[PDB]
């Protein structure tokens, strides 16, 4: 189980595999919040989370909270 703070500031609870991939998580979030994974950006420790990677890769322990904001581009 992990927690996500949604764009509007609500907290949702997710059941996740330690080896789960960010791309999947976004998919889960799409099921709950109805947001396209292409419009999601997950932030942890102030750093973004790359789709290809996995919760394991990013060291996400149980109960750790992730922050959702909208996709963005620097320019």
């Amino acid at each position: 189980q992990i927690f996500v703070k949604t764009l509007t500031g609500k907290t949702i609870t997710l059941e996740v595999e330690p080896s789960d991939t960010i791309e999947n998580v976004k998919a889960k979030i799409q099921d709950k919040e109805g947001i396209p994974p292409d419009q999601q950006r997950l932030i942890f420790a102030g750093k973004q989370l790359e789709d290809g990677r996995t919760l394991s890769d990013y060291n996400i322990q149980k109960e750790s909270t992730l922050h959702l904001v909208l996709r963005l581009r620097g320019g």
């Binding site: 509007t8 102030g46 750093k47 973004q48 922050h67 904001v69 909208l70 581009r73 620097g74 320019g75």
Partner: protein, 146 residues
């Protein structure tokens, strides 16, 4: 806008995002100061970065104007502290709140965009030798960001 801005401050007062803080400077509810702590395991670690935030009258239909007061070394942010980031102009959404804007900005610190740079001169360093770009970013943090 005030009712919206007040709500944003109240949630910031109580439960602020991991590293960020914001709130009005003095009297004017439409002028805020914010602080962003440099992300851990980045060249900005330990740096304390101050920003100014001016909410427009039609907020949040229009974006707040956000700029760095603290000097920072980064290809998408210039020496006026101007931030060229899409959610501050075209990609703005009225559902974004300062907390989330501030979080997006931290994530920009660790994931720049050298391909379409606000500061070309820093873009080349990021692209070519990254140990250098990181070296300078670290010096600027100690010089300017402490």
């Amino acid at each position: 806008a005030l009712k919206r801005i007040h709500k944003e401050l109240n949630d910031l007062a109580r439960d602020p995002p991991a590293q960020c803080r914001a709130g009005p400077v003095g009297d004017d509810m439409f002028h805020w100061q914010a602080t962003i702590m440099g992300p851990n395991d980045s060249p900005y670690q330990g740096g304390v970065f101050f920003l100014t935030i001016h909410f427009p009258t039609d907020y949040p239909f229009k974006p707040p104007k956000v700029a760095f007061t603290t000097r920072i070394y980064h290809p998408n942010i210039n020496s006026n502290g101007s931030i060229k980031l899409d959610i501050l102009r075209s990609q703005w959404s009225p559902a974004l709140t300062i907390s989330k804007v501030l979080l997006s900005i931290c994530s920009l610190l660790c994931d720049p965009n050298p391909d379409d740079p606000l500061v070309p001169e820093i873009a080349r360093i990021y692209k070519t030798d990254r140990e250098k770009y990181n070296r300078i970013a670290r010096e600027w943090t100690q010089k300017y960001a402490m």
